Amino acid sequence: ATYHLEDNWVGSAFLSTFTHEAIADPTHGRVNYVDQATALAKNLTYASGDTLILRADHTTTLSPSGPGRNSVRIRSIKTYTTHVAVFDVRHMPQGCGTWPAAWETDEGDWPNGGEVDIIEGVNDQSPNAMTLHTGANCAMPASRTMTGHATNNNCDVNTDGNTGCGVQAPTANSYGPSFNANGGGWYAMERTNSFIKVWFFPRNAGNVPNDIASGPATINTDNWGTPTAFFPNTNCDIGSHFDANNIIINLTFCGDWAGQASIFNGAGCPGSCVDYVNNNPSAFANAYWDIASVRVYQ
Numbered sequence: 001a002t003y004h005l006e007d008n009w010v011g012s013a014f015l016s017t018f019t020h021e022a023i024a025d026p027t028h029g030r031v032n033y034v035d036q037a038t039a040l041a042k043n044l045t046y047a048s049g050d051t052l053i054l055r056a057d058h059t060t061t062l063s064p065s066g067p068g069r070n071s072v073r074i075r076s077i078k079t080y081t082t083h084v085a086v087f088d089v090r091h092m093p094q095g096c097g098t099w100p101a102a103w104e105t106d107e108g109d110w111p112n113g114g115e116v117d118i119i120e121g122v123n124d125q126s127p128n129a130m131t132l133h134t135g136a137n138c139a140m141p142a143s144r145t146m147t148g149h150a151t152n153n154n155c156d157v158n159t160d161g162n163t164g165c166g167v168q169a170p171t172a173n174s175y176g177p178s179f180n181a182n183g184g185g186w187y188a189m190e191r192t193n194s195f196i197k198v199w200f201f202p203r204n205a206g207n208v209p210n211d212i213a214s215g216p217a218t219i220n221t222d223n224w225g226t227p228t229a230f231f232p233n234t235n236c237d238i239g240s241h242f243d244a245n246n247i248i249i250n251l252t253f254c255g256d257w258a259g260q261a262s263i264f265n266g267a268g269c270p271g272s273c274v275d276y277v278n279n280n281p282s283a284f285a286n287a288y289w290d291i292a293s294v295r296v297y298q
């Protein structure tokens with residue numbers, strides 16, 4: 001469909017159009033999410049020119065008894081239903097223990113207002129995962145047109161184990177150190193009543209739609225080729241499982257996914273996640289988002 005620019009966020013714009021959520025981490029990570037004033041004072045958020053940086057503290061050795069590693073979780077003030085969101089991302093956090101995400105949800109009624117994870121993973125483990133989390137009666141067909149690979153087809157968190165219904169991107173450079181070495185790329189998500197789609201295009205893609213790469217004020221997703229992840233309405237009333245969602249971009253550490261010993265050690269990371277995060281500040285120098293723009297269309 002054809003959509004038109006609704007929000008154009010670059011650099012300092014994010015400081016007026018998002019807030020920082022200074023909240024206990026819902027995912028129980030070894031993180032201290034700071035507010036906007038604190039993030040700016042500590043240079044954990046840097047928002048100027050055509051750059052937004054969102055980063056972990058990479059200097060403090062943590063008291064094991066004290067709070068987690070300082071980081072940020074930013075949330076759009078506006079909410080969205082049928083829309084397209086495009087993320088031009090130069091760098092995403094990397095490092096053992098890291099759990100970055102770019103996603104949408106309604107925190108106030110979770111999971112009943114839905115959740116779509118656009119960029120997400122843990123402990124540098126490529127590829128990217130794109131996932132819906134919903135309430136009851138929302139599943140995905142075994143076969144549908146997309147370039148990625150489905151991993152779980154029941155989206156209902158109550159009957160899947162909060163895995164959600166996920167799709168793995170087909171290339172390594174969708175995530176992690178591989179993505180960063182390649183200069184990142186573009187993630188786009190289209191949500192309608194009938195489906196959710198996510199596309200990933202590498203920075204060096206010869207075939208990235210101009211609509212995505214250059215951010216004109218008018219776009220037409222008919223022209224974007226096959227999505228990386230497709231969540232059709234075959235077995236899920238998409239519109240009834242999602243309501244008005246905020247956009248969230250965050251970085252946590254350890255917690256309910258990344259911090260599991262089998263997962264953390266399985267990735268080759270040493271010892272316990274919490275001890276690693278406490279004691280290795282320098283290892284988080286590359287635990288940053290560098291975002292060129294986020295644009296929303298409706």
Ligand SMILES: *[C@@]1(O[C@@H]2[C@@H](O)[C@H](O)O[C@H](CO)[C@H]2O)O[C@H](CO)[C@@H](O)[C@H](O)[C@H]1O
Binds near residue numbers: 110257
């Ligand atoms: C919930 O957590 C989500 C999780 O479902 C997904 O793996 O990706 C998100 C970002 O990585 C992560 O936050 O978040 C909701 C809303 O904050 C909570 O209600 C819920 O308890 C978390 O599990």
Ligand SMILES: *[C@@H]1O[C@H](CO)[C@@H](O)[C@H](O)[C@H]1NC(C)=O
Binds near residue numbers: 043046053
């Ligand atoms: C804050 O972080 C930015 C981005 O990493 C960096 O370029 C800058 O030098 C830092 N500012 C100060 C005053 O140290």
